[PDB]
Design an enzyme around this catalytic site. Sequence first.
Site, PDB file in Angstrom:
ATOM      1  N   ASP A 100       0.889  -1.147   0.000  1.00  0.00           N
ATOM      2  CA  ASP A 100       0.000   0.000   0.000  1.00  0.00           C
ATOM      3  C   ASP A 100       0.939   1.212   0.000  1.00  0.00           C
ATOM      4  OD1 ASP A 100      -1.777  -2.199   0.613  1.00  0.00           O
ATOM      5  OD2 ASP A 100      -2.984  -1.032   1.970  1.00  0.00           O
ATOM      6  N   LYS A 165      -7.067   3.639  -2.180  1.00  0.00           N
ATOM      7  CA  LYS A 165      -7.266   3.602  -0.735  1.00  0.00           C
ATOM      8  C   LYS A 165      -7.370   5.029  -0.211  1.00  0.00           C
ATOM      9  CE  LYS A 165      -4.630   2.084   3.363  1.00  0.00           C
ATOM     10  NZ  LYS A 165      -3.524   1.210   3.745  1.00  0.00           N
ATOM     11  N   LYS A 199     -10.556   0.679  -0.900  1.00  0.00           N
ATOM     12  CA  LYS A 199     -10.260   0.455   0.517  1.00  0.00           C
ATOM     13  C   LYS A 199     -10.430   1.749   1.311  1.00  0.00           C
ATOM     14  CE  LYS A 199      -6.488  -1.113   3.615  1.00  0.00           C
ATOM     15  NZ  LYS A 199      -5.149  -1.829   3.605  1.00  0.00           N
TER      16      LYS A 199
END
Length: 248
Positions: A100, A165, A199
Site C-alpha cells: 500500500d 485507498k 479500501k
Amino acid sequence: DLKASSLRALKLMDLTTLNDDDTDEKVIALCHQAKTPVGNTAAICIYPRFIPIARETLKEQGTPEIRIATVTNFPHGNDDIDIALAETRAAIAWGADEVDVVFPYRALMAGNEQVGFDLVKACKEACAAANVLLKVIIETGELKDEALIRKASEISIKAGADFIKTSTGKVAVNATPESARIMMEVIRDMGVEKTVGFKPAGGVRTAEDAQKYLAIADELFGADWADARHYRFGASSLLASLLKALGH
C-alpha cells in the site's frame, strides 16, 4: 441488517497495526486476532520488518491464506520516486503479498500530476513482477477537494493501481462516506470495477460504519461486487465491533 453486513466486512478487513514502536508480540497477537470464530480477515497490515514473524505465526495457526500487506512511501507521500521505489522493492524482499504505497498528494496539490503517475507506475512494475498487489493511498483527508480526490484516483488508476485507498490513518481526517463515494465513482466512471478495488482506511470504527461503506459499494456495483480482490477495510478496533454485532 448488521449481522449480514458485519460478516461480510470482517472477511474484507486488512487488520492493521502500524505504530512507531510495534513489537513482535503485538504483531503475533494481531495475527491471532485475524483468525476469528466466524471467519478470517482478508489480510493483516504491518510494517515490513514484521512480515517474517507474521508469516510464521499465520502458518502455525493454520491460516496460511491470510494475506500480508505493508506500506511504503509512508505516511508522507513524498515525491521522491527513488525512495518510494526502493521502499517498495524492500517490502517485496521482506515478503509482502500486497504493498500500500502513498501517492505524492502534496505534489499534486502543487500542480504536478506527472510525478504521481510515474511513482505509482514504477512501484506497480516492481510489484507486478513479484505477483504482489499494489494499493495506492491518496490521502483524501489532506487533499480535501473533490476535484483533487478524483484526479489522484484517476492518475493512480491510469498508472496501474490494483486498489485505491482513502488514507494512511496517520492524519487528522481519514475515510469518510463522502470520500468513499467520490473514489468509487471514479472506479465506475473509468470502467475499472473488474480490476481496481476500493479500501476505506482509518476512522472506520463500528459495525454501523462498515455497513455504510458496503452500502455504497452495493449501490454502485451491485451486491456481488465486493470481495477480497475488490474491497478491503483498513481498520483495527472495528474487528471487535463486528464480532460484537455477531454475538462474539
